[model samples]
Target: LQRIVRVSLEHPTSAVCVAGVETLVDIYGSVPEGTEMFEVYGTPGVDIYISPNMERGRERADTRRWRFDATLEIIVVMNSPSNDLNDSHVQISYHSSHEPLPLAYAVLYLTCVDISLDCDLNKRQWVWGPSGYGGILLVNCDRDDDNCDQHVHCLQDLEDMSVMVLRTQGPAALFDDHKLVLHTSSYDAKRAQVFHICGPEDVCEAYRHVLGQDKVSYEVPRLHGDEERFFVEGLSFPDAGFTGLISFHVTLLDDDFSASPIFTDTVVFRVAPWIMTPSTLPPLEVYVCNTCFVDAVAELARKAGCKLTICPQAWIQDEMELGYVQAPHKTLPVVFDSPRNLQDFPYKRILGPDFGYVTREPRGLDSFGNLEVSPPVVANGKEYPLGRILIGGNLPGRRVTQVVRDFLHAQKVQPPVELFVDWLAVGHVDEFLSFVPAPDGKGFRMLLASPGACFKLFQEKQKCGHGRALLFQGVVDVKTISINQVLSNKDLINYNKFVQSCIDWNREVLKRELGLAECDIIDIPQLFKTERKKATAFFPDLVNMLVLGKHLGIPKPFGPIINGCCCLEEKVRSLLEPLGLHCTFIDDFTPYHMLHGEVHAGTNVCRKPFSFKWWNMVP
Candidate 1:
């Protein structure tokens, strides 16, 4: 009789065939030699028959497919040499592989014994189920291994692949019991079965070690495909002011027992203080009073920590009131320390008939009736009755205009005052001369003109001609004193006469002598162009003119001529020149009209000089 055999190797080996055949041959040759030669001959011819049978078996199954259900049961028996044998000492485990197989069926039987258990093993205290066997037995028949099932051969290849053991949970300490169950399943549709193992603590440790570092926290959200994602929460570290890069590393171990890092990520944090000190100062308080004059006094008082109370004129008995609670003398602003005094001063004054001496019959009344005997008591005190700084606007000849005039008059060392006459009040020079009260009711002076009025004036010198050519003109010189101060005697004198004369002479001589205007004159484009051309043409003549004029002390005829000419020129330009064009130069009368006509004729002529078209020239 001949039998075929199948061999399985744990690892790849070239000598697998030699080892299987040698083992079979040795088994046959070991048969007892006492048997008759004929009887031995009747027995199978070991190597020869087995070899042929193996060949036939391989050929027979070439086109056929076989399937087998293998249920492998392992019994681990431990014993000590000095111990008595007992079935109870052995541990038995059952593992089944019911995967559908299109190829040969194999049941791998393995027995693993820890070296530490050898002492127990030697005592024969443990045994396997099959007649007290110690080793694994693979029983098989030519038919299916479903009943006597052990192993069946088919034409398909058997793939034995090792997988990296994975642990779903971390390590367990001694005395801290935990269960380790391993499960494996084939993804290939042809095989549908799970291989599992429930083992001791040592087995669990081994599994954990193979699975790399353990995470104290884990997430089990569902995932798909071969993609792998892991989450760890509630992971804490010893607090140490960590404010830099933190790294997490993940490693993947393949079925081939190779490892590599699959993912790495870092998180960084920066910490800073939460509170900051402010760096800027607070704003100032602004107060608006009934009038700027009042505002000014109040502002000063506020600075001095004083308060103001106003008294209306109607409430006070005297023209010069001496008490509080009086209506304002002339919409005047009064400073009071307390609101109750808004009516009257805390101290009262008695005015006699002679309080303010009058050369003639006084125009206004005294605080007391006619036979006044003494000055007001308020005026006699050293404290001065804590009198308010009164500011009013309705005194007979006292107003803002008067205040300004008085201020200007007091500024004696400055320019003179002059009047600029205009058409509306042409024949009414007295109207121009009549004094207008200052807004503050402090004093009075003439109201020459409103800001828009344009005209001229002549002063009788009694030495020169009747007119003396005062020639009042308005020029907006930014460098001059403010518009309010422009009416002052000093500024008026400086700008209207002295300054005007200097500039005028300078311009005239420059034109005839140097062929240029005074340096102060603004060089408007058209004017500059014309002046430049003239200067170039008469350069030498201009130098000679300057020399002659200086040597002869001619007083620069060109100066006065140019000054007067420019003044008249600007006036003419303002009044009669056509719209949209500026006067480039002021010449003798005939030339002035000629140039004016040439610049604005036909298409450029503006019927109305003061129309919107003229206003646009300012820009």
Candidate 2:
């Protein structure tokens, strides 16, 4: 007497689909209730054709009200996962007095999201530190940018899991709050909310609660604004670790809880560590002004496994430098004595002091003063280099020639490999070369400059017609050299032609004075972009080197001639390729040589010294 009707449009009712927005399903099996048993089946996580409110009722058959055309409307809801797309199915069934019948079955399709990140968009540069309980608002997000949509939120999993931020030395330090900007890459998410906020519980919760952010569902935290950036606040970075602060954390996330995230950055903040008193000093320390050497060599020192120390750029100053200070010793000086008080030279600390080699500091500032400024010594288990023939000169403010003459005579030491670089406007022999420990413990070799060698290497290339290639990005030009010379009205060939003689003289010094052989030296190809200043070496120089143990830190070429030596850096490494020598090329452009000084000029070191039994070779 009664018959069924049609099924209609539908959707999924699973939490996966319902969580973000409302889901709906509609269907009409139109099966009569007097019809027997019925059932509805659906795939999990799929939004197959279904109906939750599809009308189902008995037909009025007793009075013949049961018309031949029977129909009903119904709405249904079923859940299904997206992966079951083509495979995911839903069905409707009903029972008949004679037999059971099946009416509908539906399939689902997974949604594809074209999303990526311009993540950390809510992030702002945070200067090296933080505060407590929402500390200082060191860096705040842009009030103008649509905080929820425009910017990408933090990532879920983190890479470079952590970073070390410096704590300031005083109130005057790192006042410039830093911001790590994070934005979302191009995507097609019409409605974007944070996928999640998953990270360390205590600190992360604390970081969020302060900003009035919260987690709406799952382990992910959603943002309240038009932006997606979740940031960190509250840590400390004062000089000397006085206000040290750090915590473990995770960053942002995607829709899927465990999906790979964006900007899962790690931040560990602390203060600059080397802020110690004189009592913690190491022997034979180098005091190049901190960050003055463009701060590249510091990592170079660390690479060598050496803990380098520091001397502020503005240490107590007076006229004449240590040239005015004087010292006298009694009994023996304390191991932790202030190096400042022991000023024999503006930049000197006698080995004659740290090792048991001498009982007194330098004789006097202008007299028996120490000429040690990042002096590299060859020490084997027990014995130190008998003595080094230190190079010295008087470059207006610096005097390699003057200091060595005084340091040698006053210290009462053995013959030195002291080659005088009286040729340049720079001061330290370190400006041109560094004598690092050899791999096999045989002895040491010179990393000396050879403008001729470099010139030959390139001039030879010009012969091969790869001249333009040799015009590498950095080196100042020969034409420029000639032009500069013309301006000076000087035969500027003196720039390096002068260096060759000095090199030749030093080789002779090595062969005769230190009694070294030909193979005893290694050449580092070098050239300068220098112009004459009353005929002295000037212009940003790069050969300046610092040897921290086996690690050699060289300044990356910049200024006048960028990579001038024309691929000279790789050449230097290939030449001396020491097994243990970890070469670190430091970046120093405007901040470094631009200061009229190279790497060695701005850096000094604290070296491990030798014991007095070595005095046998010294005397």
Candidate 1 TM-score over all chains jointly: 0.11
Task: Please list the residue runs of candidate 2 whose C-alpha ends up more than 4 Å from where it truly belongs after superposition.
Answer: 1-287, 290-295, 315-385, 389-407, 416-418, 469-495, 529-543, 558-566, 578-580
- Please give the distance, in angstroms, between residue 408's alpha carbon in candidate 1 and its true position after superposition: 20
Give TM per candidate: 0.11, 0.39
Assess candidate 1 and give its lDDT.
Answer: 0.18
Q: Give the lDDT of residue 67 in candidate 1.
A: 25
Tens-place lDDT per residue, model 2, 1-619, is 1112234425432221211122332334444444454444554543222222344432221122122222332222323223321333344444455644533332222221111122221122223211211112111111211123222223321111111121111111111211212222112111112222234323323223212123222222223222233443221112221332332233333332444343233333221111111101232334454254535545555545555556443411110111101011111111112222424323233222211111123221211111222222343332223344343443344332332244334432233345555555443455565555565433556556776766665555446554444222353332223212322333444566677777677667554554445565666656554553422323334445655555666766432232444354555566656545666666654455544455555554543333221213332
lDDT of 1 by residue, 96-139 (tens): 23423212212222111111101101012223222331111111
Backbone atom clashes (below 3 Å) for every candidate: 46, 81
Worst 10 residues of 1 by lDDT: 599-608
